[PDB]
Symmetry: C2
Subunit: 301 residues, 2 copies
């Protein structure tokens, strides 16, 4: 199955300090899987005709000072290279590489070694690990059930080696509540933390099938990050100047639309590099006793 | 200049109870103008190389019970027909018609009479009246200046007759604070109103060039509408079931990112048709003494 290459002009609907860029990346994942796995992901149903959704489970966006999501402005010309990797019948890994158009070797194919071991400052690397799910009850967003639409073709797809394991990554994050081990050298934990109550926003958090929208988890994480930034006495203009060189998200659950979520955030500062921080955000559903997401942001400010 | 026809599969990034559908419509407007007016709207600059933005000024989405934005779910197949109409060198009108794919006569071209006088229940009609603007000062979002990028080609475009005037429509709305005259028969004004303070949300309201994003005005309007809906003792599930058969928005201004806006809402109920209402929302910037938007929603619930 060939990789998909696209020439993309940055539009208002896919950039800025909100979640529009991650929204576009997720739509590109559903297009890529549809093309490579001979399944209409947008209209997928199981054998009883129940809708099945290719849910986001693990999401990484890795950039750097030379190209990060905040670098993108209206009219920028990009190259996007996308492809899927076999994770069996119930899950699939999609990769996207984003380069500036015309940049040296932008036409190169996907390279696992480049994504997992030698990422280049100037390219953006996206991993989307997705899992097929159905609701266990109409109108309930809890206890989603593993699924696989009939005719889902993972058999074409290239394999990952054992070393490159989005599953090991997300398992450790569910346990540690961070993607960057607390014992990692060269950081100090600030004493300041925040815990923000966030009722589900039924205007802005909800998708076209009545679930919490995967992109709105990035918005909730940034709401927690901004609460912590303000607690540290830092300015709104400075928040809008933050360079996010790496972000990882695990979606442990969805949530009913009447839920009140809790957004917890903490920060580690670099003892090596001024302005470098690791921010961890945990999203909880206290009423059901669930952690529904974990995120780690690596920033320079 | 030919009209642009597209086959569109509804994606998560362009539907649901948020502003993603209007975000997609605006990106389609910038693509359509780029194609028909021989100008890269995404990267437009004036002669001094200052960026110039094709700002949204008047926006209408007209549907009906048979097809409205809330009808759209993942995987729906649509037909989109788009084209521009001459409004001179500083403004341009773009129309989009949206039909279900395969529906009778979905291939028909744009028809002004159909848009302005005989809209069909089952098609969606979009009007975007846009104006070229530059900032009057870097980092300021107030007192935007009229502009026209060099080489903007309106000379190709078809003409509107005098009868069809988005300008008369928006002028009346700026004066009346509604698109549906208060003296219109068959409605009664409820005494219940809301006035909500909304600090600009720098996570969710801001675009890739540091302005308030045109789609986030629709979110702010729905926040006001939901405040009024809750004031009337109505449920969240019922709000998510609302059928918006017509909505009009005028963008009178933008706003600095530290602004605190005021969202005012009022409602008229039908004395003819149960469940039919007209909701008016006014967005104010009290500190600068400006009305920055007016919206009217026609709903069935
Ligand atoms: C694509 C749409 C989505 O549904 S994605 C919404 C964001 N992602 C999620 O809600 C997935 C949350 N994760 C889960 O529900 C569970 O972790 C998952 C996939 C069901 C596995 O459940 P589990 O932890 O009980 O593991 P099992 O042993 O049961 O397998 S969208 O985001 O609204 O557009
Ligand atoms: C496209 C991007 C935009 O800038 S659209 C943002 C939403 N639209 C606006 O902010 C336009 C607000 N309107 C205005 O600034 C003014 O009404 C406009 C266009 C400058 C005309 O000004 P005016 O009322 O002073 O009339 P004049 O007599 O000066 O002409 S986006 O929405 O952020 O993506």
């Amino acid at each position: 199955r060939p990789e998909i290459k696209q020439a993309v002009t940055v539009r208002p609907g896919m950039c800025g300090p909100g979640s529009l860029f991650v929204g576009q990346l997720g739509d590109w994942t559903w297009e890529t899987v549809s093309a490579q796995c001979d399944t209409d992901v947008f209209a997928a149903r199981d054998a009883s005709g129940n809708p099945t959704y290719l849910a986001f489970y693990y999401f990484r966006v890795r950039g750097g000072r030379e190209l990060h999501p905040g670098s993108l402005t209206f009219g920028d010309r990009l190259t996007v290279t996308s492809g899927c990797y076999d994770q069996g019948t119930e899950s699939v890994l999609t990769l996207h590489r984003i380069d500036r158009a015309g940049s040296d070797d932008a036409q190169r194919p996907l390279d696992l070694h480049e994504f997992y071991e030698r990422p280049r400052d100037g390219s953006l690397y996206v991993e989307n690990f997705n899992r097929w799910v159905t609701r266990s009850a109409p109108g309930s967003n809890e206890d989603l059930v593993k699924s696989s639409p009939p005719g889902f073709r993972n058999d074409g797809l290239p394999q990952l080696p054992a070393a490159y394991s989005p599953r090991a990554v997300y398992r450790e994050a569910r346990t540690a509540h961070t993607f960057r081990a607390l014992d990692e050298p060269g950081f100090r934990l600030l004493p300041d933390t925040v815990e923000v109550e966030h009722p589900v926003d039924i205007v802005r958090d909800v998708n076209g099938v009545g679930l919490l929208y995967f992109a709105s988890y990035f918005s909730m994480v940034d709401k927690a990050a901004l609460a912590l930034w303000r607690r540290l006495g830092r300015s709104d203009r400075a928040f809008l100047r933050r360079v996010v060189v790496d972000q990882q998200m695990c979606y442990l659950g969805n949530a009913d639309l009447d839920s009140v979520l809790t957004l917890g955030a903490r920060v580690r500062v670099s003892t090596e590099t001024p302005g470098e921080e690791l921010v961890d955000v945990v999203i909880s559903d206290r009423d059901s006793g669930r952690v529904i997401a974990v995120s780690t942001l690596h920033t320079q400010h």
